[PDB]
Amino acid sequence: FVNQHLCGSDLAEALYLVCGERGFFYTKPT
Amino acid sequence: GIVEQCCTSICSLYQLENYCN
To answer: How close, in Å, is residue A17 to chain B by CA atoms?
Structure first.
């Protein structure tokens, strides 16, 4: 996994591939 | 946030590891 653009789906899919079952939280921004 | 800072900008696994347990 390199350093690409993280956006919505990709954002979760990206964390989904780094944590997968580790459970990754991506709360909303202000 | 990340939804806007990670989408408006690029992020490396490092930043990712900072949003998960």
So the answer is: 10
Give the number of beta-carbon pairs within 8 Å between A and B: 59
Distant-in-sequence contacts of A16-22, Cβ < 8 A, 24+ apart: A18/B13, A18/B16, A18/B17, A18/B20, A19/B20, A19/B21, A22/B20, A22/B21
Q: Please, which experimental method was used?
A: NMR
Say which residues have a Cβ less than 8 Å from residue B14's Cβ, sequence separation at least 6. none
| A22's tokens | 């580790």
Q: Structural domain boundaries of chain A? A: 1-30
